[PDB]
């Protein structure tokens, strides 16, 4: 589910 800092948690 959860991959990177660059990306909103949202997505």
């Amino acid at each position, epitope marked *: 589910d959860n991959p*990177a*800092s*660059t990306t*909103n*948690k*949202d*997505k």
Partner: antibody, heavy 120, light 113 residues
Framework: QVQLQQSGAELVRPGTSVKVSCKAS????????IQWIKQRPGQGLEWIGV????????DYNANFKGKATLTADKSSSIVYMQLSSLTSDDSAVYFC?????????????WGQGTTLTVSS | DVVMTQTPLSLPVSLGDQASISCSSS???????????LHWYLQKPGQSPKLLIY???NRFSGVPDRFSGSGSGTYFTLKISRVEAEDLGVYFC?????????FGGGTKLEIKR
């Protein structure tokens, strides 16, 4: 009072490199992703990259991989863009904008844009 | 890349009348989590772009009810209900569902006094 504040305006020799800065004040720096966009002057915008200041995490457009390199200073809330190996084509306006981290809800508030004129 | 497309390239409009910018995408802009993330922006001449509508239909703060976004999946249109002088500019549509984040071409709203 949320202000993103940019470096200025620069004349650069081709082959040279530049550190444009984007300085944030008024908000929690690390609650938002800083995004860098290019614009050649009378045309559309294009994305150049993403840095998350609190974690140091950088992502780039493939057209900019290895030209752009984004770095942020936590000690004093500035984010940077280093454009390596300049050429005629990098003359443009480069903005930066804030993107909320927990929720994408647009590119919120943008800086003024640094105008960078590459020339001999 | 999610080839973004706006029409018209330019839009001659008169003070008080309706105006309707339209933007269409190559991919479905609805990201797995269920949210269409198409945003609309205004760049007044010389200023830097400002956000108008953020997830397809919801307006950013202090943004007149004359503006409304609307659309689905690959088709989104923007509307100005009674054009005013302050709406001079280029309107950008952009997606942030898919990296690279791409922007539209821009429609040049021209007032016709």
């Amino acid at each position: 009072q949320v202000q993103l504040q940019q470096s200025g305006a620069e004349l650069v020799r081709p082959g040279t490199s530049v550190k444009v800065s984007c300085k944030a004040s008024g908000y929690a720096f690390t609650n938002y992703l800083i995004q860098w966009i290019k614009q050649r002057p009378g045309q559309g915008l294009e994305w150049i990259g993403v840095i998350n200041p609190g974690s140091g995490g950088t992502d780039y457009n493939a057209n900019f991989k290895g030209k752009a390199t984004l770095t942020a200073d936590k000690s004093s809330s500035i984010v940077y863009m280093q454009l390596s190996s300049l050429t005629s084509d990098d003359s443009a306006v480069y903005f930066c904008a804030r993107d909320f981290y927990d929720y994408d809800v647009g590119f919120d508030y943008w800086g003024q844009g640094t105008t960078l004129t590459v020339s001999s | 890349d999610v080839v973004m497309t706006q029409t018209p390239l330019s839009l001659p409009v008169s003070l008080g009348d309706q105006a309707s910018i339209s933007c269409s995408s190559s991919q479905s802009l609805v990201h797995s989590n269920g949210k269409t993330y198409l945003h609309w922006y205004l760049q007044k001449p010389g200023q830097s772009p400002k956000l108008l509508i953020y997830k397809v239909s919801n307006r950013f703060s202090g943004v007149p009810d004359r503006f409304s976004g609307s659309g689905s999946g690959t088709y989104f249109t923007l509307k100005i209900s009674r054009v005013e002088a302050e709406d001079l500019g280029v309107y950008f549509c952009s997606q942030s569902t898919h990296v690279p984040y791409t922007f539209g071409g821009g429609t040049k709203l021209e007032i016709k006094r």
